[PDB]
Amino acid sequence: PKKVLTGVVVSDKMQKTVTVLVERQFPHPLYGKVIKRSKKYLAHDPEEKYKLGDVVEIIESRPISKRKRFRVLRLVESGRMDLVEKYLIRRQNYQSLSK
C-alpha cells in the first residue's frame, strides 16, 4: 500500500505546495502513557485549490521535489483555523527561550 496520512494545512505560501501537520500517537515504550507526535509534510498541490486551515490528507507518491513525496488525496474538514492558530502559536513561543 501507499501510505495515507492526515493533517492540517499550515503553509500555502509555497507555489503549488502545502505543508500539513500529520500528528500521530502511540503508547510510550516503557511508561505506557500514550504520546502524541507531530511531523510537517510537504505536499504537492497541482492547482493550489487547498487553502490554509484545511484538514486534508496526503498520499505516498513519486518524488516531485527535494522534499515533496506526497500530494493531497482529498480534502475533508475545512476552515479549521483553531488548529493553525495552535501551531502557529507554538512557534510564537519560541522567540522567547532564546538568549
Partner 1 sequence: MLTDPIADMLTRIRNATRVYKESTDVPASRFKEEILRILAREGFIKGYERVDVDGKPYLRVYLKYGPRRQGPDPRPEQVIHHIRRISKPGRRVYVGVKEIPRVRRGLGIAILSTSKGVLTDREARKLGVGGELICEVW
Partner 2 sequence: PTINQLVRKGREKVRKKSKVPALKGAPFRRGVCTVVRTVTPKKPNSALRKVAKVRLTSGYEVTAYIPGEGHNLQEHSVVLIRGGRVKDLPGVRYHIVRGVYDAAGVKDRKKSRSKYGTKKPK
Residues that bind partner 2 (CB under 8 A): 28, 31-33, 35
Nearby residues of 5 by Cβ (< 8 Å), 6 or more positions away: 22, 24, 41, 57, 58, 70
63 binds RNA (CB under 7 A): yes
- Report CA-CA distances (Å) from 59 to 18, 75, 86, 94, 96: 13, 12, 25, 31, 36
Among 25, 46, 47, 82, binds RNA (CB under 7 A): 25
Stretch that binds partner 1, among 1-9, 31-39, 77-85, 89-97 (CB under 8 A): 31-39
Q: Least CB distance from residue 30 to RNA, whole Å?
A: 5
Q: Nearest to residue 20, comparing CAs of 62, 69, 53, 64?
A: 53
Among 26, 46, 47, 82, binds RNA (CB under 7 A): 26
Residue 98 binds which entry of RNA, partner 1, partner 2, none, CB below 5-8 Å type-dependent:
RNA
Among 2, 31, 37, 96, binds partner 1 (CB under 8 A): 31
Pairing of strands 70-75, 40-44: parallel
